[PDB]
Write a protein that binds this ligand. Structure first.
Ligand SMILES: Nc1ncnc2c1ncn2[C@@H]1O[C@H](COP(=O)(O)CP(=O)(O)OP(=O)(O)O)[C@@H](O)[C@H]1O
Ligand SMILES: [Mg+2]
Ligand SMILES: [Mg+2]
Ligand SMILES: [Zn+2]
Ligand SMILES: [Zn+2]
Ligand SMILES: [Zn+2]
Ligand SMILES: [Zn+2]
Ligand SMILES: [Zn+2]
Ligand SMILES: [Zn+2]
Lengths: 351, 65, 127, 88, 48, 142, 138, 114, 137, 56, 44, 100
DNA sequence: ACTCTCGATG
RNA sequence: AUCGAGAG
């Protein structure tokens, strides 16, 4: 099998889903990602201190891997992290985020209706998170004017990968808004305390998947992370140096684009972000979507050992509960039988 | 390819009766049935074996290698 | 294959022996009969290779055996192959004693006609 | 008068090697004279590999319309000749 | 529910709402590769 | 002995199709694995395994054979041992074996650690979810 | 099918010229109210005007095709009850060969234009190997 | 590929005896004899000749599977009559009839032409 | 012969009923690189080449090919090619093994240059297939 | 595998030739003829799981 | 070793570092000659 | 179809759609299937040799340019006008190792 | 919106 | 990886 661990063997009883807070993201990471260069650095078969660090996981059939060793067969994946020059949107939350901004006015950070209203009392009475959020979102998006801070809440609509306002919303702005919704307002619309917050839906810094996720025989995910890092550094270069008005914004939307398409590539937006080979590239979303996905294709059903397949034929001289098995298959397929005093002779003869 | 040496069904030798058969078709100007009958092919399995056969080796010999 | 199907003389086959029974390595003269075949395209026309071209090499030591049966009128026998102009076929054949139960090439008989009670008086058949 | 029969074979066409190679060659040749226009405005050195490699690619892969995966003709326009039987 | 039709989006909205999986569903233990509470595994075997 | 009923007997043109057994026959007992999912490779020509499909799983559920279903989905395919933090419940654990140094940067855990047996594809799913800013926290208690 | 063929495609221009030079009024000179029963002529889905007395024109065109002056591949559709004339030279059309039945037989009725003499000439060409399919088509 | 050797139809394997005499546990004074490397050719004949003996109560042969060249022959005789002796008498009868048939055919063949 | 299965006369089969010839071609080619790096056709030894195959190379000649007539079976090596990427183990293995489930006899070997001047080889192996239990008719 | 009778536990009988031989009366639950049909066979790897196969 | 041409009856013996083409021919199609070590065939 | 493409369509594609500003194109010449070897020697290619050596059975296009030139290679359908097998007899096919 | 088997081309 | 043909 593998090896002996001092830890007790336990069984997974509960699965608590949640969001990844940037704090916990950078706290979990074991390597910062500064260089977009993959492995080779100036004609050298090694790993530069940027992408694919030996800290994330060595890849040369060695015996060492981030001090913990254990080769590359025992060691799983050690996550990294990369800090974005500016916060961007998580694609799979684009809708949800856009809903939250409609349940809470701008600048302030408070629910439009409280226990003073008649219908809001009935909407906040539901214990089910999804049903509650769905009941409040429909009875709060009609509110234009507003605790105080009476501001005319703008009409927000979706456009590409940004958000507009009618009386263009910045991602940093929405970050600042979701940062001020506090705790009591989270329970009122599904979210959790320390597990999932709206201030974590937007991507401040994103975790970097280890080599056992994106191998090399380079993987598409490595290329896409290289694109994200490239856009990031190209953004930072245009920010620290000469910073025009209508030039760095395109870079912000570029980083937003690459990050958004890094996870989901089949969006309403026509740019599907092709690759060098003309391939539409494989996103993480496509890795899971059946039927060739990971869930339906590698978890619900997967290829197994100790199996066989052959053309069938009828046999009048076989019993009902019998099966005619070819000799070659019989020699191929095998069964592990422990040596006991009852069968030691027979097993010895078989060996 | 070439005329099968023996009939599949029964086992009668029919490989030595090919050329003769051809003669009985072109030299004596007979029909296939009588030609097959004269060669001692009474059973229709051997009769088939010769009548049904196509000599493809002649087209094969048309190449120089 | 068709070489295997060539009818050979099996008169004194009873004083020949199985190769699996003989105490010799592979085969010998007491168990097997070796006969060669050397053909080559000579004329511009197609050069036929019959069973008469088979030449016994091994020592028959008296036993009537190995000789390929030729019931052919012209005396050619089974048409084995055909050669073009410069095509050559050189090989050797080791013939052994065998049962038709093992392979149909060792079949001594062809079709055996068999019929009992032509009037169905036993009523073994419902017409 | 009733609705037109959209399944009528008479109002349908079958494009063989001719029309397909015609579209393909038109594309590759227009691309060729385009590139030649570029070489001309840069200033006999005509990249003939365009037409050759293009035709060869579209005939080998079966993907009609050079190297652009946006093609709806990805259903294998050119296929390996089945030679299992003469009738096949 | 992720093991049928809408896969990724279900995981997304389940990650946003911070749901709790009881892991007593068949396909869930199938994913976890554990002996699911099915027929034979619908109980426990101890010693007395 | 004669046969009662007489038999329709005669020549008929039959053809031999391309599907022969020795080109179809296949059997594998622990063979080559893939690299991404660590599961048996696809194909007879690559000495691969056969997919225990969803419908097969459904059949084994209908039968009630849970242990068999677990065997097909672990020992027969990909069976992997992972370490889980007792706090956040993620695969952040740096398990330095042969030294018993089970570290966890982010929660400072060195004594409250766990070890579970899951398919490598499940570990892949969890990691891919983690890289997609989702935390599939795995607790081992009710 | 065994005899089906695909239309190579030819030039419709000489057909157009023929039509215009054979009693076909231009479409720009068409007055519907003073000639309602005028058969409109189509060529490759294009209206080139109408034409009175379409029977003579149709027999002329058909004769020209059967002779070979017009490409035998070109299709010609005379729609009586719809009063339309659709000529198609379009490439990609799937057509098939057919025997021609004409009632030009004096001492008889509606008979095939092909006779046993033609067949005898065909089998003469077959046994010799000058009278081929093209000769039948022409 | 998985096809067995042809000679396995008439050549006895390693340790395989020609005959296997087994005491039938069903009816008393009965026996089941396993013939190896033999088919219907011998079985049908022996069985048919075991029915001619009027001191034989039961006699039946069967080939349990066409893949394998072997057949079982069950014999039941009257008390005071060992079935092996019935088999021996049947066999000798067969041999005698065959010999007489050979002699007859030879004498009949010596009187023919062409 | 129930449920669309059939019984065939083994005797007639032995006489060549529904027998067939099966030819299979394996095509390999020597690679080329910008700095004149070329893969070579040869019969490499276990000490001079990396990885190698589990099958034997004893049927290969000096040119790293099989002489037509030699019987092959299992995972035998048909074409021997190496790619170079002092030092021990200076070559990588690129040999082509016979099909794991197939067998037969090397029918004919073809050695020819490519359009770009690359020495490439097509090896045709022959196997006679005899109608067995399970063959589709 | 439409219903549970598409996967059933059988007793092995090693035989020559390269075919999965099955009884005629087991055709119906599998819905299978012999005009080229192919079946799969899986093997248990412990006593408890083969107990599951044999007893269920 | 030795080789034989395709579209002509020759008998080249050009080993490695030679290859194409042929002796007094012009074509590059070269087949390999039959082995000297004979193989037996069970005439069945 | 292929003959129609070669003898008519090609010229239309070249002439009716291309002119630069000048260099006007003229007639199009389609040769017989040839091969430019690495040896440098260009020679006639026969289908058998094409299939054996993994070559492409294609001819060369040549256009007259005003104010001749090689513009590429067109794959040739077998038994077409620009194929050696069309005017070939049975014995010729046998000699060319092509099945009649 | 089920298992297989080959081929091709990047 | 994709595509094409085929097996129940
Ligand atoms: N997409 C698909 N999904 C599942 N099964 C399929 C399939 N396509 C074909 N099959 C299987 O292929 C089989 C086809 O066999 P058929 O010969 O068509 C039955 P039949 O001959 O009409 O019945 P009979 O044997 O009772 O006379 C079907 O029974 C089906 O199970
Ligand atoms: Mg059926
Ligand atoms: Mg079927
Ligand atoms: Zn590690
Ligand atoms: Zn406010
Ligand atoms: Zn016969
Ligand atoms: Zn001997
Ligand atoms: Zn932790
Ligand atoms: Zn030569």
């Amino acid at each position: 099998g593998q090896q002996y661990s001092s830890a007790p063997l336990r069984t997974v009883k509960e699965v608590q889903f949640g969001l990844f807070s940037p704090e916990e993201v950078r706290a979990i990471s074991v390597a910062k990602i500064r260089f977009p260069e993959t492995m080779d650095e100036t004609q050298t078969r090694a790993k530069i201190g940027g992408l694919n660090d030996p800290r994330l996981g060595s890849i040369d059939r060695n015996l060492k891997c981030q001090t913990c060793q254990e080769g590359m067969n025992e060691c799983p994946g050690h996550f990294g992290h990369i800090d974005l020059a500016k916060p961007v949107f998580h694609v799979g939350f684009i809708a949800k985020i856009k809903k939250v901004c409609e349940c809470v006015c701008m600048h302030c950070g408070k629910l439009l209706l409280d226990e003073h209203n008649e219908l809001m009392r009935q909407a906040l009475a539901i214990k089910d998170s999804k049903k509650r959020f769905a009941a409040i979102w429909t009875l709060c998006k009609t509110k234009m004017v507003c605790g105080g801070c009476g501001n005319t809440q703008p009409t927000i609509r979706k456009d590409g990968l940004k958000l507009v306002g009618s009386w263009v919303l910045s991602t940093e702005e929405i970050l600042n808004i979701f940062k001020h919704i506090s705790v009591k307002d989270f329970t009122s619309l599904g979210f959790n305390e320390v597990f999932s917050r709206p201030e974590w839906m937007i991507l401040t810094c994103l975790p970097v998947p280890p080599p056992p996720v994106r191998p090399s025989i380079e993987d598409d995910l490595t290329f896409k992370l290289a694109d994200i890092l490239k856009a990031n550094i190209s953004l930072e270069t245009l920010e620290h140096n000469g910073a025009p008005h209508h030039a760095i914004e395109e870079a912000e939307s570029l980083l937003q684009f690459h990050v958004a398409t890094y996870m989901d590539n089949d969006i309403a937006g026509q740019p599907q972000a092709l690759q060098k080979s003309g391939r539409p590239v494989k996103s993480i979303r496509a890795r899971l979507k059946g039927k060739e996905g990971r869930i339906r294709g590698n978890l619900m059903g997967k290829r197994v050992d100790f199996s066989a397949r052959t053309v069938i034929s009828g046999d009048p001289n076989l019993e009902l509960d019998q099966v005619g098995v070819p000799k070659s298959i019989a020699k191929t397929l095998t069964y592990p039988e422990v040596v006991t005093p009852y069968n030691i002779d027979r097993l010895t003869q078989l060996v | 390819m070439i005329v099968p040496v023996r009939c599949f069904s029964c086992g009668k030798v029919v490989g030595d009766k090919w050329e003769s058969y051809l003669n009985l078709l072109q030299e004596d100007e007979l029909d296939e049935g009588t030609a097959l009958s004269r060669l001692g092919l009474k059973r229709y399995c051997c009769r088939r074996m010769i009548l049904t056969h196509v000599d493809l080796i002649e087209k094969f010999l048309r190449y120089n290698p | 294959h068709r070489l295997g199907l060539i009818p050979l003389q099996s008169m004194d086959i009873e004083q020949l022996e199985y190769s699996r029974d003989c105490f010799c390595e592979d085969h010998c003269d007491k168990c097997s009969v070796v006969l060669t075949l050397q053909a080559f395209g000579e004329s511009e026309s197609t050069t036929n290779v019959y069973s008469k071209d088979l030449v016994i090499v091994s020592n028959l030591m008296g036993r009537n055996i190995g000789h390929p049966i030729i019931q052919d009128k012209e005396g050619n026998g089974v048409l084995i192959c055909k050669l073009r102009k410069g095509q050559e076929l050189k090989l050797t054949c080791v013939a052994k004693k065998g049962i038709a139960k093992e392979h149909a090439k060792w079949g001594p008989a062809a079709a055996i006609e068999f019929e009992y009670d032509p009037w169905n008086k036993l009523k073994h058949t419902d017409y | 008068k009733d609705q037109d029969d959209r399944d009528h074979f008479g109002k349908k066409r079958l494009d063989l090697a001719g029309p397909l190679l015609a579209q393909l060659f038109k594309t590759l040749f227009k691309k060729l004279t385009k590139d030649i226009f570029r070489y001309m405005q840069r200033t006999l050195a005509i990249n003939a590999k365009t037409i050759t490699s293009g035709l060869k690619y579209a005939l080998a892969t079966g993907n009609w319309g050079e190297q652009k995966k946006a093609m709806s003709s990805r259903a294998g326009v050119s296929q390996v000749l089945n030679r299992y039987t003469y009738s096949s | 529910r992720c093991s049928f039709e809408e896969t990724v989006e279900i995981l997304f909205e389940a990650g946003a709402s911070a749901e709790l999986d009881d892991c007593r569903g068949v396909s869930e233990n199938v994913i976890l590769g554990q002996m699911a509470p099915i027929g034979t595994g619908a109980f426990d075997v101890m010693i007395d | 002995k004669k046969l009662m009923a007489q038999i329709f007997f005669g020549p008929t043109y039959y053809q031999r199709l391309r599907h022969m057994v020795d080109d179809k026959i296949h059997a594998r007992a622990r063979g080559p694995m893939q690299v991404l999912t660590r599961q048996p490779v696809e194909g007879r020509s690559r000495d691969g395994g056969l997919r225990f499909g969803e419908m097969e799983r459904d059949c084994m559920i209908a039968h009630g054979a849970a242990s068999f279903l677990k065997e097909r989905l672990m020992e027969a395919s990909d069976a992997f041992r992972v370490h889980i933090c007792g706090i956040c419940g993620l695969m952040t654990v740096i398990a330095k074996l042969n030294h018993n140094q089970f570290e966890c940067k982010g929660c400072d855990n060195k004594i409250d650690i766990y070890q579970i047996h899951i398919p490598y594809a499940a570990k892949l799913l969890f990691q891919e979810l983690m890289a997609m800013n989702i935390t599939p926290r795995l607790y081992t208690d009710r | 099918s065994l005899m089906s063929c695909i239309s190579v495609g030819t030039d419709p221009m000489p057909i157009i010229t023929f039509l215009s030079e054979w009693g076909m009024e231009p479409l720009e000179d068409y007055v519907p109210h003073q000639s309602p029963d005028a058969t409109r002529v189509f060529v490759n889905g294009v209206w080139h005007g109408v034409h009175r007395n379409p029977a003579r024109l149709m027999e002329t065109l058909r004769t020209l095709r059967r002779k070979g002056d017009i490409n035998p591949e070109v299709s010609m559709i005379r729609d009586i009850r719809e009063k339309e004339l659709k000529i198609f030279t379009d490439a990609g059309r799937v057509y098939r060969p057919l025997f021609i039945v004409e009632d030009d037989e004096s001492l008889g009725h509606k008979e095939l234009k092909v006779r046993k003499g033609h067949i005898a000439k065909l089998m003469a060409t077959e046994y010799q190997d000058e009278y081929t399919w093209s000769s039948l088509l022409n | 590929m998985n096809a067995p050797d042809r000679f396995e139809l008439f050549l006895l394997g390693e340790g395989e005896s020609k005959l296997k005499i087994d005491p039938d546990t069903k009816a008393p004074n009965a026996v089941v004899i396993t013939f190896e490397k033999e088919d219907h050719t011998l079985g049908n004949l022996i069985r048919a000749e075991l029915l001619n003996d009027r001191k034989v109560l039961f006699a039946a042969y069967k080939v349990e599977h066409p893949f394998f060249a072997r057949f079982k022959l069950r014999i039941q005789t009257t008390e005071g009559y060992d079935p092996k002796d019935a088999l021996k008498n049947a066999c000798n009868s067969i041999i005698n009839k065959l010999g007489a048939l050979k002699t007859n055919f030879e004498t009949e063949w010596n009187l023919q032409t062409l | 012969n129930q449920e669309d299965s059939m019984i065939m006369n083994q005797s007639s089969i032995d006489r060549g009923l529904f027998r067939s010839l099966f030819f299979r071609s394996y095509m390999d080619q020597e690679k080329k690189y910008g700095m004149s790096i070329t893969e070579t056709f040869e019969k490499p030894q276990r000490t001079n080449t990396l990885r190698m195959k589990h099958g034997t190379y004893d049927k290969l000649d000096d040119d790293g090919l099989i002489a037509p007539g030699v019987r092959v079976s299992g995972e035998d090596v048909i074409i021997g090619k190496t790619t170079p990427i002092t030092a021990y183990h200076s070559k990588r293995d690129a040999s082509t093994p016979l099909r794991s489930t197939e067998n037969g006899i090397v029918d004919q070997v073809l050695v020819t240059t490519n359009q770009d001047g690359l020495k490439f080889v097509k090896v045709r192996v022959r196997t006679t297939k005899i109608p067995q239990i399970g063959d589709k008719f | 595998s439409l219903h549970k009778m598409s996967m059933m536990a059988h007793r092995v009988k090693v035989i020559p030739y390269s075919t999965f031989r099955l009884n005629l009366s087991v055709t119906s639950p599998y819905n299978a003829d012999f005009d080229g049909d192919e079946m799969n066979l899986h093997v248990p790897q412990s006593e408890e799981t083969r107990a599951e196969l044999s007893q269920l | 070793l030795k080789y034989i041409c395709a579209e002509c009856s020759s008998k080249l013996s050009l080993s490695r570092t030679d290859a194409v083409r042929c002796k007094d021919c012009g074509h590059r199609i070269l087949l390999k000659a039959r082995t000297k070590r004979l193989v037996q065939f069970e005439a069945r | 179809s292929f003959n129609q493409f070669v003898d008519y369509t090609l010229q239309d594609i070249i002439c009716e759609d291309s002119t630069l500003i000048e260099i006007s194109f003229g007639k199009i010449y389609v040769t017989k299937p040839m091969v430019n070897e690495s040896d440098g020697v260009t020679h006639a290619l026969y289908p058998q040799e094409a299939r054996l050596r993994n070559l492409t059975y294609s001819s060369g296009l040549f256009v007259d340019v005003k104010k001749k030139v090689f513009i590429g290679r067109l794959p040739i359908m077998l038994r077409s006008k620009n194929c050696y097998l069309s005017e070939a007899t049975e014995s010729d096919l046998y000699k060319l190792k092509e099945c009649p």
